[PDB]
Short mmCIF file of C-alpha atoms in Angstrom, two decimals:
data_model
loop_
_atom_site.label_atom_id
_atom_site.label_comp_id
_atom_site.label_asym_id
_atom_site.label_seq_id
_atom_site.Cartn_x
_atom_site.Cartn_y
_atom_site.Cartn_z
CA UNK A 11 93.73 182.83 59.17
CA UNK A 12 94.73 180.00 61.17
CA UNK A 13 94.83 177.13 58.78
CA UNK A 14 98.30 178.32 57.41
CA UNK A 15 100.03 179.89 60.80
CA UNK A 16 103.70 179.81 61.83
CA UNK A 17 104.13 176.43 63.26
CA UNK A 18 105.99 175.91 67.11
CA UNK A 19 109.56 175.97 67.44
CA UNK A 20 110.70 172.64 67.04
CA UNK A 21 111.13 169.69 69.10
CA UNK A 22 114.47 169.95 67.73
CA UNK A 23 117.02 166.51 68.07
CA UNK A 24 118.77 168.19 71.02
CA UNK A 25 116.22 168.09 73.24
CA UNK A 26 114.88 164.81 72.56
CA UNK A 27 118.25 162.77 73.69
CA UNK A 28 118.17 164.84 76.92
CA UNK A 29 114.40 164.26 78.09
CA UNK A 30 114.48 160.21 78.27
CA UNK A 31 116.51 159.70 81.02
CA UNK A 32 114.66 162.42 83.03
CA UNK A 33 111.59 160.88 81.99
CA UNK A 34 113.14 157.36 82.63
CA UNK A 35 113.28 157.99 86.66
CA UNK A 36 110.35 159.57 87.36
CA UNK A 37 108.33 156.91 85.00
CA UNK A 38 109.48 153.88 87.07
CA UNK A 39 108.92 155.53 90.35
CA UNK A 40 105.78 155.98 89.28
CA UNK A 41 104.39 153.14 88.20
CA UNK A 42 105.89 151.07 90.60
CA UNK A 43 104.50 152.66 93.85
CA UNK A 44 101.15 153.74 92.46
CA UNK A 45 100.28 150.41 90.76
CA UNK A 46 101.03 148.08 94.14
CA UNK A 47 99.98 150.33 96.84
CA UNK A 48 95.91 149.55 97.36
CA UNK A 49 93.82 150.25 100.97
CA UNK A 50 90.43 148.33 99.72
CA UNK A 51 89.31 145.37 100.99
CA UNK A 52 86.77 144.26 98.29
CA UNK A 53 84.76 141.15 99.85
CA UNK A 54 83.57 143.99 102.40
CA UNK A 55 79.94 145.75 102.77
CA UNK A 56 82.11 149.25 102.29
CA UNK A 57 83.09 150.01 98.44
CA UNK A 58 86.74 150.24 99.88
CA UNK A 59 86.96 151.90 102.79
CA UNK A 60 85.59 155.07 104.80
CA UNK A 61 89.50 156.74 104.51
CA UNK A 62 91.24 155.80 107.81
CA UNK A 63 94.41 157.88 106.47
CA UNK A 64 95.13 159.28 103.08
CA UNK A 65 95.88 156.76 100.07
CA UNK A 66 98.88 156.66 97.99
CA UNK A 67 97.52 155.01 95.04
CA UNK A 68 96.92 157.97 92.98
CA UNK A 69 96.14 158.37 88.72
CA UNK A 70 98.28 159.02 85.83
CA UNK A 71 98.57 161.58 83.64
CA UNK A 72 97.99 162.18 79.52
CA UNK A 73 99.06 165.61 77.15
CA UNK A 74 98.91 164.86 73.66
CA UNK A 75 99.91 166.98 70.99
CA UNK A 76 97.85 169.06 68.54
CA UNK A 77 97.26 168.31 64.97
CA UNK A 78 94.86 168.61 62.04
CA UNK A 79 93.61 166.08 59.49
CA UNK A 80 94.98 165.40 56.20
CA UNK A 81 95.32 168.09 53.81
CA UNK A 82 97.68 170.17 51.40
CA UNK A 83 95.43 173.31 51.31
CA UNK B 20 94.80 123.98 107.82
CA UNK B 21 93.00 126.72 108.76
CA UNK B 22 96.77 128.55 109.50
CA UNK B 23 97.47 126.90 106.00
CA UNK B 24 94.68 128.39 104.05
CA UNK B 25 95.28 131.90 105.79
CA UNK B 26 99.35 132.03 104.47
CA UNK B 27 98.00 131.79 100.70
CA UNK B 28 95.85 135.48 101.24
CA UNK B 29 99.31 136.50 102.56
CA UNK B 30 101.10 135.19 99.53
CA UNK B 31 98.38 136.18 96.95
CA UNK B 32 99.21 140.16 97.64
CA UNK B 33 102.88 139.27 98.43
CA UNK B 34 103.12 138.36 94.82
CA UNK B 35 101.65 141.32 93.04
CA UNK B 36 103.55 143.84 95.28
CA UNK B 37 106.87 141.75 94.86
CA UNK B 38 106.88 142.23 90.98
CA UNK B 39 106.03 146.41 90.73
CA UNK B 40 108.14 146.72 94.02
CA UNK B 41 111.35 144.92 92.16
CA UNK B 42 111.21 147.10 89.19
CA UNK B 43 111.91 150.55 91.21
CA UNK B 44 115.17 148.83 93.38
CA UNK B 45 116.99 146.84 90.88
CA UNK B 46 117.54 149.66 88.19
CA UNK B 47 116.36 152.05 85.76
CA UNK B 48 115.15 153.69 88.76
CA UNK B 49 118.31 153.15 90.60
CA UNK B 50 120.21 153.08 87.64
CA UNK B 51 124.00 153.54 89.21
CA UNK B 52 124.98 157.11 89.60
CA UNK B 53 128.02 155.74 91.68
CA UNK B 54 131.56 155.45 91.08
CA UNK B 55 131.86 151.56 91.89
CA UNK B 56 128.66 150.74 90.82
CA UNK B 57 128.79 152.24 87.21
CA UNK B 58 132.62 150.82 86.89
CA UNK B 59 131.31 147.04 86.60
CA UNK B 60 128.47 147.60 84.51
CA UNK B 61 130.11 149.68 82.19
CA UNK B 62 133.40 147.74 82.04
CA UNK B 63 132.17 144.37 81.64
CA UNK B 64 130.21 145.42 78.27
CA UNK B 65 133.61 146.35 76.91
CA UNK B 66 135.28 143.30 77.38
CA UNK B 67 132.88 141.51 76.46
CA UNK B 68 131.94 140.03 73.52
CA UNK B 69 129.12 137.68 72.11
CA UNK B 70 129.59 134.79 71.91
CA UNK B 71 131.22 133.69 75.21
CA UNK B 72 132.26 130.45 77.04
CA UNK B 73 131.41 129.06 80.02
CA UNK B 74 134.56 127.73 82.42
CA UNK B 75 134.83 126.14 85.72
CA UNK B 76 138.27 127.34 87.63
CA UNK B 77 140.51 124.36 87.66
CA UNK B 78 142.74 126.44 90.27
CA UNK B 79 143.59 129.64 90.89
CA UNK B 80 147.46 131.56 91.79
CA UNK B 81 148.17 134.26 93.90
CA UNK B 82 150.06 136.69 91.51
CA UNK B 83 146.83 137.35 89.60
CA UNK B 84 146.41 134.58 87.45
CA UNK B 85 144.46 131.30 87.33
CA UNK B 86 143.96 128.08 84.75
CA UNK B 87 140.54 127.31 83.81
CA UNK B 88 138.88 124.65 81.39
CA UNK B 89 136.92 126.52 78.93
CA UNK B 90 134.22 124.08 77.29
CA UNK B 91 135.14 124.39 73.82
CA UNK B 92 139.33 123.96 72.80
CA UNK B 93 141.62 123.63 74.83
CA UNK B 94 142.50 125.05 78.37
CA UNK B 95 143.45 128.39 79.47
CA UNK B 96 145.67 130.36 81.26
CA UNK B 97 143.80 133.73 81.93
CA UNK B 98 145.12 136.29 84.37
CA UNK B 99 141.70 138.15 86.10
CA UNK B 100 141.22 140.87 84.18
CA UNK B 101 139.42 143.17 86.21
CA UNK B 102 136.98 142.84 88.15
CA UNK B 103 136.75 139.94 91.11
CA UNK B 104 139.66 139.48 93.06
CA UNK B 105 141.34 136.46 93.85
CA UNK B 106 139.28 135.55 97.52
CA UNK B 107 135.76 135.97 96.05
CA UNK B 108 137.39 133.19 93.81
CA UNK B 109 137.52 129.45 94.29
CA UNK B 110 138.21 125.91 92.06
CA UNK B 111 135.57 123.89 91.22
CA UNK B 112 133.33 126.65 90.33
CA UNK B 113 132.07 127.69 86.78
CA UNK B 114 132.91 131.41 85.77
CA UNK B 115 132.16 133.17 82.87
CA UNK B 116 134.88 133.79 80.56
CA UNK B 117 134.95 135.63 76.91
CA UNK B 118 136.16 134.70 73.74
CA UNK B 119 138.17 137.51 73.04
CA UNK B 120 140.14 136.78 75.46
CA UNK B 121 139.45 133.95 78.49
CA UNK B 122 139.56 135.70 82.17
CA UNK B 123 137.00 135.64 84.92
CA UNK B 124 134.67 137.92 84.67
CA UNK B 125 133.36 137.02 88.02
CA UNK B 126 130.94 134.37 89.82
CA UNK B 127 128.18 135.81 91.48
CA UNK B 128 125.52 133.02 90.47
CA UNK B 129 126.79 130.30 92.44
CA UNK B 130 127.59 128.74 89.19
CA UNK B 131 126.01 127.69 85.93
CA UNK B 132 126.16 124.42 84.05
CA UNK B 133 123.61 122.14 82.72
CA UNK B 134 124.50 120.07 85.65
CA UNK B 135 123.88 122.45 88.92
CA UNK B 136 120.28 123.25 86.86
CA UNK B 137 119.19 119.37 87.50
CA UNK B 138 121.04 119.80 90.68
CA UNK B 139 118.80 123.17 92.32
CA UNK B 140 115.24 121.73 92.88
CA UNK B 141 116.13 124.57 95.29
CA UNK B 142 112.64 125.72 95.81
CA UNK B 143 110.91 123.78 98.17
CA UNK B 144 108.09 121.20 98.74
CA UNK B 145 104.95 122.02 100.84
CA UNK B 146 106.02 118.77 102.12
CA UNK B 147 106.31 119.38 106.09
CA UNK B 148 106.12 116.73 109.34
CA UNK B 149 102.85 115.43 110.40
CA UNK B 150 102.06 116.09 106.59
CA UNK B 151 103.55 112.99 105.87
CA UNK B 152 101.91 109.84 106.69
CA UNK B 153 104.80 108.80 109.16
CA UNK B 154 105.63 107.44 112.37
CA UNK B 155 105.91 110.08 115.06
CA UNK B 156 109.33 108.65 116.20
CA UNK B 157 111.03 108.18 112.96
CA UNK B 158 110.43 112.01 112.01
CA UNK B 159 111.51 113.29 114.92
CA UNK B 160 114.85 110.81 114.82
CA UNK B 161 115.53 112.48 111.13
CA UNK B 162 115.01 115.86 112.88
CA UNK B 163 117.63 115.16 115.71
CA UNK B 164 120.40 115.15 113.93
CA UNK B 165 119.99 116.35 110.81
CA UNK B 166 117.77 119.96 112.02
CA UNK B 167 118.39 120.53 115.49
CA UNK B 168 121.98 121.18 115.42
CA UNK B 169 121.22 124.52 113.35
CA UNK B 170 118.03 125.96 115.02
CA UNK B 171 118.95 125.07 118.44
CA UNK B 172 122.42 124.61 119.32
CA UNK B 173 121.60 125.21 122.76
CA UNK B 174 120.75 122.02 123.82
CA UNK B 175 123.69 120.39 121.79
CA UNK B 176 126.18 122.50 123.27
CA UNK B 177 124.95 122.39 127.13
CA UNK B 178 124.45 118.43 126.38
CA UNK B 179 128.35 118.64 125.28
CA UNK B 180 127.44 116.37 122.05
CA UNK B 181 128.65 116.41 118.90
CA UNK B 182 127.15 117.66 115.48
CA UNK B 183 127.46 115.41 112.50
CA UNK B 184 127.79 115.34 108.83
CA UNK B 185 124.94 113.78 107.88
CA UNK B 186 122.32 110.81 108.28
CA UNK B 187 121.89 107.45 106.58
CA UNK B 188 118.08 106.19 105.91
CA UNK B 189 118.08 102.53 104.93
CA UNK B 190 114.50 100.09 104.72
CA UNK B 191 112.97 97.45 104.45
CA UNK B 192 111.82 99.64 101.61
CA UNK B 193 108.66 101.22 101.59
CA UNK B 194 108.83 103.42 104.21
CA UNK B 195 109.01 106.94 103.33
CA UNK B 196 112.20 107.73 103.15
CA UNK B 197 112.20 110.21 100.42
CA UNK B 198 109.08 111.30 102.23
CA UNK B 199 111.03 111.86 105.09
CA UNK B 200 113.66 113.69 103.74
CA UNK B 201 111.23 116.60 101.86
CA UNK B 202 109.63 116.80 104.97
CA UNK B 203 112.69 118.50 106.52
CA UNK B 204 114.16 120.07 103.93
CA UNK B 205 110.99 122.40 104.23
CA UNK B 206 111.49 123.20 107.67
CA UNK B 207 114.87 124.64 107.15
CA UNK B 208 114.02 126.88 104.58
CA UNK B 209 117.67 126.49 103.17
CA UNK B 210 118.28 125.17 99.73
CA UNK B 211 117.26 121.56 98.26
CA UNK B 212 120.02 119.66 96.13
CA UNK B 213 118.83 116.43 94.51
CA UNK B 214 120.28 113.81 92.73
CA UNK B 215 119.70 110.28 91.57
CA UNK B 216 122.09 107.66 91.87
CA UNK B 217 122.10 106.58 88.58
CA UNK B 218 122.88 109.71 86.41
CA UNK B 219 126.50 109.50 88.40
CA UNK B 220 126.79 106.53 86.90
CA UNK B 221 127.72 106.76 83.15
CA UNK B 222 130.03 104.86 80.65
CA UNK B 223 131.78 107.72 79.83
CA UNK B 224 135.43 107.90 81.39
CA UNK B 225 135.86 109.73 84.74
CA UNK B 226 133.09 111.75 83.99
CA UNK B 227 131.47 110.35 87.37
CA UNK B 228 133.41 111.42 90.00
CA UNK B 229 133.34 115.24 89.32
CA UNK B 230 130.18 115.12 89.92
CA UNK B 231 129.88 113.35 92.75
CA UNK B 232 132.25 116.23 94.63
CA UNK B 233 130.79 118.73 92.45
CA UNK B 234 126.85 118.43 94.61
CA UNK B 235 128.77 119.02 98.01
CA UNK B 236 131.00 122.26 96.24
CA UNK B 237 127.68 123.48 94.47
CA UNK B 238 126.04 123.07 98.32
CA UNK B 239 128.35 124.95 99.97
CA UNK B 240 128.31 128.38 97.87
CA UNK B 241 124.25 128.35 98.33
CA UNK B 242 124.64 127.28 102.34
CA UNK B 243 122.60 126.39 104.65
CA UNK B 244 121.66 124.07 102.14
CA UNK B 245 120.63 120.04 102.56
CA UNK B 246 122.02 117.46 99.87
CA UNK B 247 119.48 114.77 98.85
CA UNK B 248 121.30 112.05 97.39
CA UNK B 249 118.90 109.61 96.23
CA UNK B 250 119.37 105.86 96.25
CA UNK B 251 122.86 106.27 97.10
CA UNK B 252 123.83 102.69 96.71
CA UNK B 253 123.42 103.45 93.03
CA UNK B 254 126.69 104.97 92.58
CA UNK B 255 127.90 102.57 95.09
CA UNK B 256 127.48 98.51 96.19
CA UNK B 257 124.83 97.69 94.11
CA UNK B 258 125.66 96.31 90.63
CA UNK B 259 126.76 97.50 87.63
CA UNK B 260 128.60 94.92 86.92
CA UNK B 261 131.47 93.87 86.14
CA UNK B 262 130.92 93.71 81.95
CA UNK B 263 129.45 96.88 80.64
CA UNK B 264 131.80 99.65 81.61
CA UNK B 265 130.77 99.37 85.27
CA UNK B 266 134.00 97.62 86.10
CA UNK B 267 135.87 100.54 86.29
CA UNK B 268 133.11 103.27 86.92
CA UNK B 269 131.67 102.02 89.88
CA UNK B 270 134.49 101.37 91.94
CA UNK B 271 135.87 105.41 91.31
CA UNK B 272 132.05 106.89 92.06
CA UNK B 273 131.26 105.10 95.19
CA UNK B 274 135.00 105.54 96.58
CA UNK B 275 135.02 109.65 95.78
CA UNK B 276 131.39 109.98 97.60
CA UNK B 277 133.09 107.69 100.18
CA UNK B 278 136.07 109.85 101.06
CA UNK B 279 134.15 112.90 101.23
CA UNK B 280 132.09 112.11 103.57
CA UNK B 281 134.10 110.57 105.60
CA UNK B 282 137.15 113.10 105.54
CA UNK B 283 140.16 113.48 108.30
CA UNK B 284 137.61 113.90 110.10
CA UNK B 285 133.99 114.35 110.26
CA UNK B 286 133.96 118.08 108.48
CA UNK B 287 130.66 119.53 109.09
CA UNK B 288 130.19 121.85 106.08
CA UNK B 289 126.84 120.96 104.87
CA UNK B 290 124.31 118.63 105.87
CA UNK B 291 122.97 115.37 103.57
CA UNK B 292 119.89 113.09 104.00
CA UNK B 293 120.88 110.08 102.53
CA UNK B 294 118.07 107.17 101.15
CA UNK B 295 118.64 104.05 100.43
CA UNK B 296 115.90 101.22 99.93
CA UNK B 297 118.63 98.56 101.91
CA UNK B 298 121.94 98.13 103.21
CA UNK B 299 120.60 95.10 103.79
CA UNK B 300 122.34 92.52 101.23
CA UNK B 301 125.03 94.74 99.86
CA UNK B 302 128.52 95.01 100.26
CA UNK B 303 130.52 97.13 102.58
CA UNK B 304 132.20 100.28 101.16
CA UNK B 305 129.52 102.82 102.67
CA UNK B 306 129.36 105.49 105.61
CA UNK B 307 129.39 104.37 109.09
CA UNK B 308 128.30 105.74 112.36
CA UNK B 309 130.41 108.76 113.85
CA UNK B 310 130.73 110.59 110.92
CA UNK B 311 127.29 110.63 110.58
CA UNK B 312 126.80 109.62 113.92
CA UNK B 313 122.85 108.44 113.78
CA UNK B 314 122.00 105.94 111.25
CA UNK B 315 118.35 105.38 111.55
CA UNK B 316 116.63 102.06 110.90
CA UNK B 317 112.83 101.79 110.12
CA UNK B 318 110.78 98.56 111.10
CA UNK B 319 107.95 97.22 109.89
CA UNK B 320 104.51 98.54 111.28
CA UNK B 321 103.64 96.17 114.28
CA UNK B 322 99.71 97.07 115.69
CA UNK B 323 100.81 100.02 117.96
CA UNK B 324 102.80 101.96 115.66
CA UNK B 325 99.71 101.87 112.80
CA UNK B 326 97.62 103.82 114.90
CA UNK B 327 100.04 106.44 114.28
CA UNK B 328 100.75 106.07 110.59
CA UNK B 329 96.95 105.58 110.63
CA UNK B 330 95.04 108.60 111.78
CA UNK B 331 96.81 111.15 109.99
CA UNK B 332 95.56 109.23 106.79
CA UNK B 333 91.55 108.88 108.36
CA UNK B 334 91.23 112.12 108.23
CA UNK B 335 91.43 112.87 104.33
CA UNK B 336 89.73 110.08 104.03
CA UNK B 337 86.02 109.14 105.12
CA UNK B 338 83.78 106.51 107.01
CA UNK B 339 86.37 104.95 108.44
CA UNK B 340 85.71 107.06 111.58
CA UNK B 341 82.32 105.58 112.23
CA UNK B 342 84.16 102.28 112.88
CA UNK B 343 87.01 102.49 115.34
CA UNK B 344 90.30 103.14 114.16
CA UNK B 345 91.63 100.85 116.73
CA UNK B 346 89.27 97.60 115.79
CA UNK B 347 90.44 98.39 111.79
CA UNK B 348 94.18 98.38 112.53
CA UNK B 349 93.97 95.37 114.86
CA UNK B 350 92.25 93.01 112.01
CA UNK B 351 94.40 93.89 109.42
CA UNK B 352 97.86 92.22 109.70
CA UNK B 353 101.55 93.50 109.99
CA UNK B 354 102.80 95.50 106.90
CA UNK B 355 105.40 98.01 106.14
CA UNK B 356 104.32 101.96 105.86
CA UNK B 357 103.80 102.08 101.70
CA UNK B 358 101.49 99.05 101.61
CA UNK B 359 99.54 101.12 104.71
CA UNK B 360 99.14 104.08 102.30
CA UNK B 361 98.59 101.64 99.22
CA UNK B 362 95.55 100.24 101.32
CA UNK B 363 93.70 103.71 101.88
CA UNK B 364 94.10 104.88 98.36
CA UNK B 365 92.97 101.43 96.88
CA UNK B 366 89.90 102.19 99.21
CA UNK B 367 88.88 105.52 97.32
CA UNK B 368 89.72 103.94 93.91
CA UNK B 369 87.78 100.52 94.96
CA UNK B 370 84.67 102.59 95.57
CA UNK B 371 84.49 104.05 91.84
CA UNK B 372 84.59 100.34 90.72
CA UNK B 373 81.79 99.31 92.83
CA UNK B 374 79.90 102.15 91.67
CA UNK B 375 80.22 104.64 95.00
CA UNK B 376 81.64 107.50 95.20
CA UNK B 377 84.21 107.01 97.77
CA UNK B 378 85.35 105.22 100.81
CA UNK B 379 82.98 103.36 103.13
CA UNK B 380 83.97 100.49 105.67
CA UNK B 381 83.33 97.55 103.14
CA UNK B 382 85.81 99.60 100.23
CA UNK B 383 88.23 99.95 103.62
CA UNK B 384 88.14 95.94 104.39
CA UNK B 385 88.46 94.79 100.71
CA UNK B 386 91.60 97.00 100.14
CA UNK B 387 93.33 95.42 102.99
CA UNK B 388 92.93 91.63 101.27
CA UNK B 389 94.11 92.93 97.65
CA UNK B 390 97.54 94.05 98.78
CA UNK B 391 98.09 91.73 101.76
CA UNK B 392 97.38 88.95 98.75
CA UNK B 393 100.29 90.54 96.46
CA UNK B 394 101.96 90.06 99.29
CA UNK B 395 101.30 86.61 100.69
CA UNK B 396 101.75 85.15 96.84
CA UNK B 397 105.41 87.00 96.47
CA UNK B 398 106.86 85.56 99.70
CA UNK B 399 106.04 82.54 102.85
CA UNK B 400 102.43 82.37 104.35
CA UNK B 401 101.55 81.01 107.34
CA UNK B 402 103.04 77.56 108.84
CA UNK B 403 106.15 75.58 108.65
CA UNK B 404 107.66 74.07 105.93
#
């Protein structure tokens, strides 16, 4: 039953102009502060450090987008 | 050293946090969402075109208009479309201009030919007093006037004495007086023209003197800034000739650098550290004291003044230090401060041909023949004739 279902509503073109420049701000804001900012001091016997106060260096995130292998039936 | 060492752990984070930290201020982060700030990006990609030529402002009017020398055809008479006004503008700087049609965009670069690039070695050496292998004196003469006015006016101004221009270095050669002039130039922390002599001097007509006023205008828009005008008697006294198209260009390079300097009076825009290997046989036509007020002469290392040159060099260096520095300096006879650094780096090279490693007290008393040799076969020994 689900190898033929109704697929999503689109992405549609609309939509896809819009996002970038939302996606444009938040992506160099990003990158910028969480790449630079570091509290580790690595030619010490601590690993980085015990915490003193909290870090700012932080992860990113990752969706992807669902799909199935080639096929026609 | 040790405070040397420590700046470069500084630095080495400085570096990495400079480059993300740029990326969020300068835009697409801060992309303008402001009425003036989106007007001149936006407008200027309008007028423009692609291609586009490069101008210098031969002189501006007040009504809104201004004649510039574009670099291909012919001049222009562009009115300032948009954009800068006519303050922020001034002749003898290069604006951009387009095709389409020729205006100032605007100047915001402190120019841009070929000729400021050579010009900007604007970063600056690691150079730095008591680096150099100097005399203690001779620095700290340099310093005087050239420095001091700027970091301390206080004592100038209680003293009641007056600021100059500039300062003239002249040998006997071999003395550090490029050295000298790095050395300062550091300590400022304020932009480093340089020049050589020679490139003023072409065989191309009038091409000479434009740039000779053109290092003092480039100076000024970048101040602070020191102007290193190497071997200045280049452009000036010392020959060309008289039969290869220095019979006209000489005379017009050496006067315009002249008059400058020299002014109505002594003008006080930017300072210059001028090097020259002599004044000694050449002709008149150069600065003279009280525009640049201090001229500084360098002698020739006597016995007292070696220690100094000396121990700053000992201590790179190696076994020397077993033997007294005073005994060494004292056998060795008087020569000037380049054949006192030749000596101690023929000492670590002498070592590799004897098969050592590197300097011992028989390398250190060989090296002190060899050049003292080059010497005493060049010019008079030792009694009358």
């Amino acid at each position: 039953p689900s190898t033929f279902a109704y697929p999503a509503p689109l992405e549609v073109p609309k939509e896809k102009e819009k996002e970038k420049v939302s996606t444009a701000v938040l992506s160099i804001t990003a990158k910028a502060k969480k790449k630079e900012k570091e509290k580790e001091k690595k030619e010490e016997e601590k690993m980085e450090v015990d915490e003193a106060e909290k870090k700012e260096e932080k992860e990113k995130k990752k969706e992807p987008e669902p799909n199935f292998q080639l096929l026609d039936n | 050293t040790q405070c040397r060492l420590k700046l470069l752990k500084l630095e080495r984070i400085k570096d990495y946090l400079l480059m993300e930290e740029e990326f969020i201020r300068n835009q697409e982060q801060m992309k303008p969402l402001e009425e003036k700030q989106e007007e001149e990006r936006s407008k200027v990609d309008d007028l423009r075109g692609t291609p586009m030529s490069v101008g210098t402002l031969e002189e501006i009017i007040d009504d809104n208009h201004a004649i510039v020398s574009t670099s291909v055809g012919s001049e222009h008479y562009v009115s300032i479309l948009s954009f800068v006004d006519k303050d922020l503008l001034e002749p003898g700087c290069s604006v951009l201009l387009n095709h389409k049609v020729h205006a100032v965009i605007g100047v915001l670069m402190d120019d841009t030919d070929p000729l400021v690039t050579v010009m900007k070695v604007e970063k600056a050496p690691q150079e730095t007093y008591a680096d150099i292998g100097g005399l203690d004196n001779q620095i700290q003469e340099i310093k005087e006037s050239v420095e001091l006015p700027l970091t301390h006016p206080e004592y100038y101004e209680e003293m009641g004495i007056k600021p100059p221009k500039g300062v003239i270095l002249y040998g006997p050669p071999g003395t550090g007086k490029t050295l000298l002039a790095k050395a300062v130039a550091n300590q400022t922390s304020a932009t480093f023209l340089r020049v050589v002599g020679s490139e003023l001097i072409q065989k191309y007509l009038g091409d000479g003197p434009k740039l000779v006023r053109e290092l003092f205008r480039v100076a000024e828009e970048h101040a602070p800034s020191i102007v290193f005008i190497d071997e200045i008697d280049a452009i000036g006294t010392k020959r060309y000739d008289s039969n290869s198209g220095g019979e006209r260009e000489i005379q017009r390079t050496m006067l315009e650098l002249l008059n400058q300097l020299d002014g109505f009076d002594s003008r006080g825009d930017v300072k210059v550290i001028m090097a020259t290997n002599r004044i000694e046989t050449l002709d008149p036509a150069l600065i003279r004291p009280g525009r640049i007020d201090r001229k500084i002469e360098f002698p020739l290392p006597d016995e007292k003044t070696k220690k100094r040159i000396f121990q700053i060099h000992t201590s790179r260096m190696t076994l020397a230090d077993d033997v007294t520095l005073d005994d060494l300096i004292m056998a060795k006879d008087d020569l000037s401060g380049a054949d006192i650094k030749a000596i101690c780096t023929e000492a670590g090279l002498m070592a590799l041909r004897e098969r050592r490693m590197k300097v011992t007290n028989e390398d250190f008393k060989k090296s002190k023949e060899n050049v003292l040799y080059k010497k005493q076969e060049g010019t008079p020994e030792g009694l009358y004739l």
